[PDB]
């Protein structure tokens, strides 16, 4: 049982390179608009407190170089919506897929197409964490890489990459330019809130381990929902809501392990640890697989 | 560090479905040829004990249905090459990328585009285990899905999916139809060899740790490849080859640490344990990232 990303071709056809001054990053070309992080217009002289509205009005369309492979796209207008710069271009992208912009909830997952200089480099699954960070693999030049899910033929874009935090995790925005979490597009060291663990996902992953014939962590004990939640919170896990208990019904039915029995097993794991054993090859409890991600596998 | 696949679009544009009778699986359409597992010509009962030469001689071009989505590609020739069927079709694929067919070595990683009915479902990174199996998410109808790497703009195709073993792991061929490992495309119980840890990839992981400033485990001393191999086998680690030493070259140059010096460091870790310490934050040594993967994610 491994993470699986969506096929990335529909998104690859939308990636372009955007340069302003000496800063190059990636943009997303949908119809006649290129979306990218607005920090492309900041410089080392103003990055600690960039007055983006003042910077933006002082730019001309010709200050923005947009390259789609071999072709330069002509910028015919520029504006910003929150932290996303929108460059209107004179050509609609002929590879624009059916798409929507969504804001994802913490605990949900998405695929990331990591890009550098407008070129797709890698694809992998990420979770929006409760503290609104993501554990990406984003290096220099990755800004403007996007996160998405695919439903039928429709690409739902939910993330655009802007920054790294001193702990090595990442922060960014939805495609309306609003950050996930309390982060700001200035060049400062920003800490996140406490990194609470996605309990319903850990449980889903324990069900996945059982489906794959790993059973060593199960116990006969049970627990009430509140007694589980008291221990979960002691360990900086999310309390399990009734909606989340419901979401786990399929896996519970499939395995014949009631949700609260799996909670009792997780409680035992939190209090004792794994005593040098592994689950699905991991010495750590994994919380980036949703119940949905598990079922479809 | 995380498993990262290559972008799949160049391969998505080459996936088709191939049907014989009611048996449907995926194929790969490059120029005017479609490549797919030869067991497409089998009924389910034929798969228990197939005579492929006899099955194939009973087939004509007009018995093969190739579809790109709902669009039929007429078959104008057919041949069998080892365990792959090659169907010549009337249309050259306009989306054919620059490509090569490569036969990988165990320990190497590659991306799989898991496909059903010629439609891509998901993409993920796999390591070929030393026993020539892969740990895939392959459900029924996934045969003919391919594994690949992308270098520059060139797609190197290295794997085509054929079968599941009793243990739940998977087996397949290169794009010339030769199986990886001692497997045959017959629905018979077959066992893989005992799996072992991919030593070259553990060494790449130790080099990655050094690159990130985590170097408490470095030995002052060096060993020979033979001494290392004889010890490593006692810990269920794969013996190193000269090609493994060679692919560690860039990481050895980046760190200034000779491959055989890192081997002596790993030997000491196997013999003495971690003694409570961690490497890259982990008490376990990781074997799923190649030297190339380490460079891709550290640089």
Q: What is the DSSP string of B148-195?
A: EEEETTEEEEEEEEEEE-TTS-EEEE-TTSPBSSS--SSSS---PPPP
Q: Which of B159, B119, B169 is nearest to B37 (CA)?
A: B159
Are A71 and A16 in contact, with CB atoms under 8 Å apart?
A: no
Q: Give the torsion sign (CA, B207, B210, B216, B218).
A: positive
Residues near B46 by beta carbon (within 8 Å), at least 6 away in sequence:
B55
Angstrom CA distances, A296 to A251, A293, B45, stand at 11, 6, 28
- Residue A228 φ/ψ, nearest 5 degrees: -60, -50
Q: A26 touching B, CB under 8 A?
A: no
Obtained via which technique?
Answer: X-ray
Given an 8 Å threshold on Cβ–Cβ distance, is B114 in contact with A4? yes
Residues near A102 by beta carbon (within 8 Å), at least 6 away in sequence:
A156, A157, A158, A174
Resolution, given in Å to one decimal, reads: 1.5
Q: Provide the terminal-to-terminal Cα distance of chain B, rounded to the nearest Å.
A: 12
Q: A175 touching B, CB under 8 A?
A: no
Pairwise CA distance, residues A102 & A149, whole Å: 10
- Residue B139 φ/ψ, nearest 5 degrees: -95, 180
How far is Cα of residue B109 from the mean position of the Cα atoms in its chain?
A: 6
- Detail the DSSP E strand segments found in chain A: 15-20, 23-30, 33-37, 64-68, 71-73, 75-81, 84-89, 98-101, 109-116, 119-127, 146-151, 154-164, 170-173
Residues near A154 by beta carbon (within 8 Å), at least 6 away in sequence:
A97, A98, A99, A100
Angstrom CA distances, A174 to A105, A128, A142, A148, stand at 11, 11, 16, 10
Q: Give me the half-sphere count of Cα atoms (radius 13 Å) on the Cβ side of residue B281.
A: 6
Pairwise CA distance, residues B26 & A72, whole Å: 38
Given an 8 Å threshold on Cβ–Cβ distance, is A122 in contact with B296? yes
B10 → chain A, closest CA residue? A9
Q: Gaps in chain B (C–N > 2.5 Å) come after which residues? A: none
Pairwise CA distance, residues A19 & A259, whole Å: 51
- Detail the DSSP E strand segments found in B58-106: 64-68, 71-73, 75-81, 84-89, 98-101
Are A157 and B38 in contact, with CB atoms under 8 Å apart?
A: no
B114 interaction partners in chain A (CB closer than 8 Å):
4
Per the DSSP assignment, residues forming a β-bridge with B160 are: B146, B173
| d(CA A283, nearest CA chain B) in Å | 7
Per the DSSP assignment, residues forming a β-bridge with B265 are: none
- The single-letter DSSP state of residue B272 is H
Q: A62 touching B, CB under 8 A?
A: no
Count of all residues that appear for chain B in the document? 299
Angle at B253 between CA B251 and CA B259, to 5 degrees: 65
For A7, which of B3, B113, B299 is closest by C-beta distance? B113
How far is Cα of residue B178 from the mean position of the Cα atoms in its chain?
A: 13
Angstrom CA distances, B227 to A51, B237, B239, B257, B259, stand at 63, 13, 10, 18, 14
How far is Cα of residue A282 from the mean position of the Cα atoms in its chain?
A: 22
Angle at B10 between CA B7 and CA B16, to 5 degrees: 120
Establish whether A39 is a catalytic residue. Answer: yes
Secondary element (H or E) of residue B271: helix B259-272
User: Left (φ > 0), alpha (ψ -120 to 50) or beta: where does A87 sit?
Assistant: beta
Q: Which of A199, A211, A156 is nearest to A288 (CA)?
A: A199
Q: B297 touching A, CB under 8 A?
A: yes
Pairwise CA distance, residues A144 & A15, whole Å: 9
């Amino acid at each position: 049982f491994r993470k699986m990303a969506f096929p990335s071709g529909k998104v690859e056809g939308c990636m372009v390179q955007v340069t302003c001054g000496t800063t190059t990053l990636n943009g997303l070309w949908l119809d006649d608009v290129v979306y990218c992080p607005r920090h492309v217009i900041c410089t080392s002289e103003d990055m600690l407190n960039p007055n983006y509205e003042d910077l933006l009005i002082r730019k001309s369309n010709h200050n923005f170089l947009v390259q789609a492979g071999n072709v330069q796209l002509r910028v015919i207008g520029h504006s910003m919506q929150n932290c996303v710069l929108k460059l209107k271009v004179d050509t609609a992208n002929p590879k624009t897929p059916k798409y929507k912009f969504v804001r994802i909830q913490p605990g949900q997952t998405f695929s990331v197409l990591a890009c550098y200089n407008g070129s797709p480099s890698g694809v992998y699954q990420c979770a929006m964490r409760p503290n609104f960070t993501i554990k990406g693999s984003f290096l220099n030049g990755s800004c403007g890489s996007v996160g998405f899910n695919i439903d039928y033929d429709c690409v739902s874009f939910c993330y655009m990459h802007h920054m790294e935090l001193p702990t090595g995790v990442h922060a960014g925005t939805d495609l309306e330019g609003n950050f996930y979490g309390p982060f700001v597009d200035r060049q400062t060291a920003q800490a996140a809130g406490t990194d609470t663990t996605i309990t319903v996902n850990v449980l889903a992953w324990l069900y996945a381990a059982v489906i794959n014939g790993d059973r060593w962590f199960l116990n006969r004990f049970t627990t009430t929902l509140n007694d589980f939640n008291l221990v979960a919170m002691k360990y900086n896990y999310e309390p399990l809501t009734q909606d989340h208990v419901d979401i786990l019904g399929p896996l519970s039915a499939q395995t014949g392990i009631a949700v609260l029995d799996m909670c009792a097993s997780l409680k035992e794991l939190l209090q004792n640890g794994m005593n040098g054993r592994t689950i699905l090859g991991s010495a750590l409890l994994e919380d980036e697989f949703t119940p949905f991600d598990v079922v479809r596998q």
